[PDB]
């Protein structure tokens, strides 16, 4: 579209717009879940490596 003639634009619609605004959310949530699990397990085992 950026290669199209001047004065022509575009918009994503439907699930496409939701996908555009939901980028990297899954990775951030996965990392946060891993951190929370690590913290909980460290609390349970009273160790930073177990």
């Amino acid at each position: 579209i950026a290669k199209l003639p001047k004065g022509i634009g575009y918009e994503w619609t439907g699930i496409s717009l939701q996908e555009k605004q939901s980028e990297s959310q899954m990775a951030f949530l996965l990392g946060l879940s891993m951190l929370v699990v690590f913290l909980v397990l460290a609390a349970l085992y009273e160790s930073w490596a177990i």
């Binding site: 946060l32 951190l35 929370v36 913290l39 460290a42 609390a43 009273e46 160790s47 930073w48």
Partner: protein, 50 residues
Amino acid sequence: MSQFFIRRPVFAWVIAIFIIIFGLLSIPKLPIARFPSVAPPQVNISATYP
């Protein structure tokens, strides 16, 4: 009781880390404005009789 945490430093540190992470997540998403919604709300009816 502080005696629980004296013998278990890891679990006290985990609580602090949880608080720090939660606050660091909260700050980005907090709205910023000079004052809150202090002024009384107003609703306007506009009519036209040309």
